[PDB]
A paper describes a structure:
The human mitoribosome comprises a 39 S large subunit (mt-LSU) and a 28 S small subunit (mt-[name]). Human mitoribosomes synthesize 13 polypeptides, all crucial components in the oxidative phosphorylation (OxPhos) complexes. In this study, we focus on exploring the function of [name], the human homolog of EngB. Structural analysis of mitoribosomes from [name] knock-out cells shows the accumulation of mitoribosomal large subunit assembly intermediates that are incapable of forming functional monosomes.
Therefore, we performed FLAG-IP of C-terminally FLAG-tagged mS27 (mS27::FLAG) overexpressed in the GTPBP8KO1 cell line and subjected the enriched mt-[name] complexes for cryo-EM. As for the mt-[name], we were able to classify the particles into four different classes which represent a mixture of late mt-[name] assembly intermediates and mature mt-[name]. Specifically, 37 % of the total amount of particles represent mt-[name] sub-assemblies, all of which lack the last MRP recruited to mt-[name], mS37 (State 1 and State 2). Indeed, in both biological replicates of [name] knock-outs, mS37 is the most downregulated MRP of the mt-[name], as assessed both via western blotting and mass spectrometry. Aligning with this finding, our cryo-EM data revealed the presence of the stable mt-[name] assembly intermediates lacking mS37, while the rest of the resolved mt-[name] complexes (~60 %) were fully matured and associated with translation initiation factors.
Numbering used by the authors:
A (entry chain 0): 165 to 218
B (entry chain 0): 4 to 55
C (entry chain T): 2 to 169
D (entry chain R): 64 to 358
E (entry chain U): 27 to 103
F (entry chain D): 345 to 430
G (entry chain O): 46 to 239
H (entry chain M): 10 to 128
The structure:
Amino acid sequence: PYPPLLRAMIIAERQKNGDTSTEEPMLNVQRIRMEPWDYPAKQEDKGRAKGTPV
Amino acid sequence: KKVRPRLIAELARRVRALREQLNRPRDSQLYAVDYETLTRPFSGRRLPVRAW
Amino acid sequence: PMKGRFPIRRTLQYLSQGNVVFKDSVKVMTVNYNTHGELGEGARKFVFFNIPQIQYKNPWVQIMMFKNMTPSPFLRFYLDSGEQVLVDVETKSNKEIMEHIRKILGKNEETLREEEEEKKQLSHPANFGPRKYCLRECICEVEGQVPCPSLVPLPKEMRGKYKAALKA
Amino acid sequence: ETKKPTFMDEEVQSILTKMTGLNLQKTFKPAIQELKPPTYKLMTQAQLEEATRQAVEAAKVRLKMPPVLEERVPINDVLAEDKILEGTETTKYVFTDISYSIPHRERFIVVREPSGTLRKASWEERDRMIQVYFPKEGRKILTPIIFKEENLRTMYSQDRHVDVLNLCFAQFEPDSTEYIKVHHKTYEDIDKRGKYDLLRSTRYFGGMVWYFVNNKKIDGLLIDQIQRDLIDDATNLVQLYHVLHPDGQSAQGAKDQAAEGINLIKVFAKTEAQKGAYIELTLQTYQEALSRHSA
Amino acid sequence: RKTRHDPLAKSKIERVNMPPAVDPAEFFVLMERYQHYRQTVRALRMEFVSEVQRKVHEARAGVLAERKALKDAAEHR
Amino acid sequence: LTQGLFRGLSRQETHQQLADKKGLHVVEIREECGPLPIVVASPRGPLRKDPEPEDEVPDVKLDWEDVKTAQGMKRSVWSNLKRAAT
Amino acid sequence: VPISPYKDEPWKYLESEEYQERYGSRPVWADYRRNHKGGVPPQRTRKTCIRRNKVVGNPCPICRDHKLHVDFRNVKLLEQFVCAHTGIIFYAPYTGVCVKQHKRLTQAIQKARDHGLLIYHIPQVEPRDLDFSTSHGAVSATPPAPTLVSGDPWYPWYNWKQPPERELSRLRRLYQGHLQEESGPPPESMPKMP
Amino acid sequence: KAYRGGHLTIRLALGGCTNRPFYRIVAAHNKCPRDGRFVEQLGSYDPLPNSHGEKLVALNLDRIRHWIGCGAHLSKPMEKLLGLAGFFPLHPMMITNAERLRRKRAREVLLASQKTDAE
Ligand code: FES
Ligand SMILES: [Zn+2]
């Protein structure tokens, strides 16, 4: 679902424009592929420590 | 409106970049670890307590 | 008094009375007028009264004037596309020239209101800040909300001095 | 089928506009405010007629009767109930959409209560929040104390009824519960004390006639019109009354007798008017005086 | 705040910040709420991003924008 | 200042004279009374049927002190100072 | 000690013969002048004419007469400090009143206008809205969501869901020696202190 | 001014005098000062309750959706104000801190009951 207020504002545009429907506004969460936090990132775009020995 | 050239800022910039490419530390120096004090001798920084 | 003849021209009220706002096309305006002759009288009055009003409304438009180069006066505008608009202003009054160039190259009253309405959305009444930009600086100026401590001292229970002492 | 005219109909607006009248001396009365030196213009006989003609056009734009609306319905709509947030807060939040290009009656104003309920702000809360972020000159966040019964009577005692209506129009909305009660009290006092003239040549006269005709209290107003040689306005008021109440004794009687002009007042006076006897006596006197002038 | 060239304090040389204790249940439950919350907010972000493209493309190459440039150019001729 | 004040205050033209001189109505326009035209004086003689020729720009000598004040340029720490009732 | 008898009814002093014999038809401040250097006076008057029950040399119009009470009911005295042509309260240097009484007059004058005792110009403003329809969802009814009718949360994860035993075992193993007591499902509703 | 890296964020800019906090929602650069230069002001939040007992939160939803579609981030306090309004989902920590408070208050009711019961 959309969060409550946004859903209320999506149903008011419809009725303001004159469109009459009983369908629910819903977000397509199929595109978003949630990867784990421990997924290998790119080491070829990562930096390196500078040569400042201590 | 004619900026007075700053040549020493360009000479040094090239030299510093060059040295970073000829004196660069290796993986053996950067990623060495003392297993008794659990610090990186290169930088003297303790590792996190969850990795020990 | 104010030096010069017709000193009312050198006033902000008179310079803002022009209703000729050129479009984005108009880049250069050239005025060719004759100092003497009855036919050229209107152009002389157009350069004496109306030209200041046009340059004040169109400060990025170049306005150049040439004297006694041709037998008759005329106006010529140079658009940004490369088009030249000739306007023979002989045997015409200054009011006719000002009304003629406002119809072929000037904006109407509908296009001007839109521009002014776009500037009313830049100053939101809800926003808080300095008087220069916003109406109110803080929300302590709104009746009902907790007033500023400078005018009305807050209760001892709402101040961090006693809270710390009260806690310890 | 057969719809009863509303307050904004052309046929009704033209009647209430004529009853209101136009008085420039009273419409453009010298306001008490910061002053500037006046400007003088040398005008001819014809330039003065055109200048006075433009004042009649501006006074009819200043006398535009405000629309009469009905009491708005309370807003009781819950968007969400979140029981997990119960007890996590002591006070409630009021969120307002301060987007500029939005009408104030299409603006979303919600309230997250301490019980986790996300409801819509009520009318009293909406109007207050719109005056905090979109302040309007003349309106105050906190309801003034002049609209109390005791303070209003004080104003009524000074014949300042037009001031009470202007303050209410600048503080409350036409469809409020306080704008309809403050107006009716003013109208009711006018009928009691016969101060109809005060609202004449204003934008609040049409609304005063619409409340009496619908509540059948035009006896006082009709008498005042008769006492001011205003039969034209007196006859149009009965005609209006008939239209709104077709199935009435007077309306049926008129059609039967095809009464016109002064006749309508007589038919209405007997059949429906509460003060039937008084109207006839007042109407009688007027008719007698008119005959003398004709002679 | 300090810079890179400022020496470190001598009171922090021997400082070790121990991580907080973990509640297996709450931590697992809290890791899923973030998982879903961020998936619900990423979809909304895309929606808001999709409205900014339209408006931008509905002003320079829109049907109501190309219908007025011809009206303004036709009146000029 | 005394001999000059009485000279200028006695050589001032009233609204009635202005009407008689020009045979036209002198109308007073006030912001408080809005656009309503108030007739302050009317000519006793024949009212002229032709209006005064309107002038696009008037060749009247102006005062820089007044123009400088209307354009918000007259800075003075002594003007419009709070004083007693006079 | 001055004990004015018109303390409760201050409006009776202006309609008496002692006021007419002292002030007459003019205002109380008509015959008051400030003492200062130069022709240009200071932009502010003295804070107060009474300091610790002691009056100064030249008291102001309100402080020189103890029978003049600045109340919101004494409309006849408050009209002397408001212009009858512009409806503006005069500044202190005009009348000569002190900051304390001029600050008390303004408060009394704004309270007489809020009670309908003092007449002031009330303009005829325009409507706030161009439309008056109340059919929009913002001020109307919104179709209740399924979750709201079923007494369920907007999102499922809002409610606590007990995790499986195998996963907690990973965490315990992951954080050995740095653990806290496992927490059971929270109570459905917030408790209250009896 | 140009910052190396950085991005835009919709945060809160603290304002008001001592013991009288007033926040004003703004879209500003990450590296800019809290109450420094801002691109736009998108609302205001008054923490202190008013006479009616309510906290005022102004939200310019129209402009908040524009800057979120241009690459602007959100701060935790600003992400919790939109969950209370219903524009965003309830922040996970708003739900977890509410559960911790329940257990806390349920743990204190036992002691109170025992005292009145045992004693
Ligand atoms: S200015 Fe708002 S609190 Fe001081
Ligand atoms: Zn004093």
